[PDB]
């Protein structure tokens, strides 16, 4: 159920939508314009905010040897959610 | 008349350079006091053949060589171009 152009094109998770003037749109006549129906960003806000009672924590991003490499993120500032640079799934220190 | 502008080119060190430099030193200031509007102009090193230019009348121009001429010869030359 992606946001749909006035033409009927389905814009993408980086909006590529062609303009009514552009001739190139004709290449979609009779054949489907393919886009992944499941956006990425929409699954980031899907995730809960993990909380740790420690000060500084790790993310393997899904377990050892499969995932992104280790990085320790600093949760010191609690007025924002410290985010992993690979996954994007937030962390906080509980109160 | 007709002269729109007059151009000169010298160099820093060479015989023609010293000659027409002397010309500019003594003669120039009064030459410009004579005619305010004609935009005579001066530039820097052209290694040899310092010469000069004069532009006027729908782009028409004339090209004379100043190579190692006396400040006298330069004087009567520019007075020739200006006079016309």
């Amino acid at each position: 159920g992606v946001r749909t152009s006035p033409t009927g094109e389905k814009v993408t998770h980086t909006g590529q939508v062609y303009d009514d003037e552009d001739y190139r749109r004709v290449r979609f006549v009779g054949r489907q314009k393919e886009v992944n129906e499941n956006f990425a960003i929409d699954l980031i806000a899907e995730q809960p905010v993990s909380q740790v009672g420690s000060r500084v924590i790790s993310c393997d991003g899904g377990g050892g040897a499969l995932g992104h490499p280790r990085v320790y993120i600093n949760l010191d500032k609690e007025t924002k959610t410290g985010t992993c640079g690979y996954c994007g799934l937030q962390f906080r220190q509980q109160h | 008349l007709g002269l729109r502008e007059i151009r000169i080119h010298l160099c820093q060190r060479s015989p023609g350079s010293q000659g027409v430099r002397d010309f500019i030193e003594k003669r120039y200031v009064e030459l410009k006091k004579a005619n305010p509007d004609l935009p005579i102009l001066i530039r820097e090193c052209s290694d040899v053949q310092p010469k000069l230019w004069a532009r006027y009348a729908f782009g028409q121009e004339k090209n004379v060589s100043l190579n190692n001429f006396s400040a006298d010869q330069v004087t009567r030359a520019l007075e020739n171009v200006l006079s016309s």
Binding site: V56, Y72, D76 | -
Partner: protein
């Protein structure tokens, strides 16, 4: 670092928070500054800021900026000195500050 008692920043709450020296205390600060050769006068940042923590149990950032003003030095040096040394507490404490040596033959 990962292991720390408290971080070092000013997040909030004391931009303008009032701090003023006492006139006799200005006399004192003048006496201190007289102990350094002229052309420097920045050497007094540490003793004067000491004094600030002395009359006010803990120094707000307005005290740091204020000392920087008194000595006409760039404040970042004042913050720097305030953080680098142990004596200065940048957060309020009680009237009595208890300190024990846990390291070595005391340990």
């Amino acid at each position: 670092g990962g292991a720390l008692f408290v971080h070092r920043d000013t997040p909030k709450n004391n931009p303008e928070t009032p701090f003023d020296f006492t006139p006799e205390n200005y006399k004192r600060i003048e006496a201190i500054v007289k102990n350094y050769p002229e052309g420097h006068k920045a050497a007094a940042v540490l003793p004067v800021l000491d004094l600030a923590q002395r009359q006010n149990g803990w120094l707000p950032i307005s005290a740091m900026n204020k000392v920087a003003e008194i000595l006409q030095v760039p404040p970042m040096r004042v913050y720097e000195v305030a953080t680098f040394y142990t004596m200065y507490n940048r957060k309020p404490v009680g009237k009595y500050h208890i300190q024990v040596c846990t390291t070595t033959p005391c340990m």
